[PDB]
Amino acid sequence: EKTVSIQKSALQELSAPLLPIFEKISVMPLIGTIDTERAKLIIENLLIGVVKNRSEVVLIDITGVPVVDTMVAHHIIQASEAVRLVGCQAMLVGIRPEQIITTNTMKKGMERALALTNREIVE
Amino acid sequence: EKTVSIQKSALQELSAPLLPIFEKISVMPLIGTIDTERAKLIIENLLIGVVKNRSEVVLIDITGVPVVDTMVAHHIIQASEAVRLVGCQAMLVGIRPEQIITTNTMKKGMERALALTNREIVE
Amino acid sequence: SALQELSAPLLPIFEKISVMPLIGTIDTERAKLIIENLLIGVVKNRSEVVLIDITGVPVVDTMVAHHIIQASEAVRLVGCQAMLVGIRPEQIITTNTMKKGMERALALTNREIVE
Amino acid sequence: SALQELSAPLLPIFEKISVMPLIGTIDTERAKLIIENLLIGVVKNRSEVVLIDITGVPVVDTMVAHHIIQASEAVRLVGCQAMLVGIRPEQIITTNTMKKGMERALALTNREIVE
Amino acid sequence: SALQELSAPLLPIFEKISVMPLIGTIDTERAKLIIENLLIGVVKNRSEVVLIDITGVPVVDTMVAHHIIQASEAVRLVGCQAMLVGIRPEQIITTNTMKKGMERALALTNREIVE
Amino acid sequence: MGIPILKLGECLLISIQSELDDHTAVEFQEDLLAKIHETSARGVVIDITSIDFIDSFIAKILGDVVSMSKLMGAKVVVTGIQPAVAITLIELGITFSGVLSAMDLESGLEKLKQELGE
Amino acid sequence: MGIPILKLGECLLISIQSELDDHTAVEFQEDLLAKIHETSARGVVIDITSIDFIDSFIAKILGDVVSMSKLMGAKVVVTGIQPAVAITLIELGITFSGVLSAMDLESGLEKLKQELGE
Amino acid sequence: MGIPILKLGECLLISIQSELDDHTAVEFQEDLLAKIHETSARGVVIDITSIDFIDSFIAKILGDVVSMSKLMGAKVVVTGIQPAVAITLIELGITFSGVLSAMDLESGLEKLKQELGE
């Protein structure tokens, strides 16, 4: 575990499609991975940034700290616009001891991404 | 002890943005990861078979074996007819000891990706 | 076993093929070529949706998807499985699902559907 | 043997029956009815155009023809032979051949074909 | 006497060739290319009306026919003989007559002859 | 004899009957090209419906006179290949692409005729 | 230090003067791709009008910077090739297809803007 | 050997990489004014984005061809002046009136193609 466990810290990507930049969080759910938003908000304004998905549709589960995940969803209203939260699993939404826009699936988020910035899918 | 090596293979996501398919790879293009293509192909027939975007813009660099990565571009003609290849690097294309569709970036890739599925993004 | 399962509509003859894992079943090449001029039909879908796997017989399979083109319209291998694309040590048109290859079939031969 | 000669197109899902006219092969009742709910098919063809003749089968082949009408809709027999219709004590829409049973099947579900 | 030919009609230059069966006259592609770049060269003709035949190597003549595409624009061999092609031991465009070899050359500059 | 050439409406519906000899094909090879040179045409429709056996040099000669009349400026087609002669082309590795095959002499006419003006 | 790049509305340009060695080109081959990373592009236009002789290894380099710049996304136009470079020296082991050659730099743009970018 | 000057459609796009001394400046001065009479032209776009330091013995040579070309019969534009070199131009003090410079070679050709020969 010399350089494998630190190269895999550089695996919280941010692919850059059409103007809403979307993310793909597969598996890094522990508290030690604080950088899933720190390597988002830094590189948010780096390119031209508008409303950003998260797309955590295959992830189980956040343990007891959504402070790093869903409290900071109010903090990308600052640099960028109002982020979504695409496709929570059924075991994930059960964890509610304690708003934000969400979407059932990944393609429907892009259906209302362009409704925000006034675009459609024609032809 | 060695739980780092598990969940190192399964970080090649296949999110479906507007239903062609999307993908993204980081810098791990070694020959031991044959799942860079055989885990994108088992899902390719599962969801809709229209054009794939690999988007390997951060991958520096492949070592000496692109015949597992550029033989599949002539092999997702099977079960998907199609394929592109988005944003190579300079030292990456420096490896040419020896067609398919390529594009500079994703926001110009997604334009002609919707040409094959015969749709526009306007207004 | 005389099983070939032609089931041919108006112009496009096609085929439904389960596991037939021997070169002794070469008659799916013989009966397919002989039926190609017994009716005037130019498109041939293939539909190998449930077939895994094959090792040493694409020499019958791909070449019979090559020598129809010298007698009719081109063919389309429909639904090559995920455990089949890796075994390609050596083109044509093809597709993914059976009903959408048929939708592509009329477009090459001057026909469309309406509702 | 254990075989299902059933392709999977759109809503006119059809079938093909070659010569297996023995009552032990009840899977043509099983692997059609149990596949019927797995994909939404409204109308349904048979195309038993080859096998001659039928003696102890067709009560199965007509209980299949009335376990689909109560399952979804509109089974239809396609092209019975000449010896096959000798003494049938046992309705169902039928037709003459496969290319024209489909156009009486698309027209049943209010869908059309132009050019 | 060193003379091979040239002409220069409206936009597309073209070149005549009478019978001269040898290889040592490589000037017919030298004097072609040193003048094709002078004026604004577009598609050009060869017109082997009287040429019977080049003996063993028109590879020098037919690979330079590729190399006009990299210089300015494509080329066309107008009216080969029935014996000049008579054995082919080894693409480009061609036409049988000069009167329609010129006609589908003005289409390559998108021009048509109205009355 | 044996090989007629008809010259119908800037098209050559040349047929091929039950002939076998490669020497007859060499006798045939000059007859097709010297016709289309002396009589200017634009598309040749060969027809090999009768032949069921071929030598290896026949596939070379019929592999020639398709590429021969292509170089003379004619979009030559091949109409009505039998199954058994199409069986023995999967072993002899000829590469009949760009030859524009057809189905029969009826549909083989308008398929070439749609590729020329009309 | 002699090879400029003067990009013009997502369409680059390349001037090339008289070279004498392939050690110049290896320092040059990295410079073209380093520019096409820094800016977006649709077609680079290489101009080699001022060259009358070419080293055979340099032809391997200029035949490579086509395919180094195809993968980045942009097209290429090798405009204004002289006779004496082309006639007996580009008969070597090239595979020049899909190259879209031109005649001069003014018309070389309108053989690219007619295809891509407009 | 020399400063690479190309041509575009009815315009000239001269680009400067670097210099040596006044001897290269008079050699470039003899290059441009001869070429603009060696062919026909109406607009020169001088690119000096790659220069960060210019001596007073050189700025008059770029003060010459910015005004000797107007009398020659073509309007000129010197796009992309660096901020380091732009200080010592007017710290010397020479007005570039009638020049109408721009920021980059794309936007430099916007005004010149608009103004003369719309």
Author numbering:
A (entry chain FD), B (entry chain HD): 140 to 237, 251 to 275
C (entry chain Q), D (entry chain P), E (entry chain W): 148 to 237, 251 to 275
F (entry chain O), G (entry chain f), H (entry chain d): 1 to 118
From the manuscript:
In bacteria, the stressosome, a key inducer of the stress response is a very large nanomachine that responds to diverse environmental changes by triggering a protein partner-switching cascade of events, which culminate in the desequestration and activation of an alternative sigma factor. Here, in a first step toward understanding the molecular details of stressosome activation, we report an atomic resolution cryo-EM structure of the L. monocytogenes stressosome. The stressosome contains 20 dimers of RsbR and 10 dimers of RsbS, arranged in repeating units of 2 dimers of RsbR and 1 dimer of RsbS. The L. monocytogenes stressosome core proteins, RsbR and RsbS, display the signature β-strands-α-helical arrangement of a typical STAS domain where a central 4-stranded β-sheet is flanked by one α-helix on one side and three α-helices on the other.
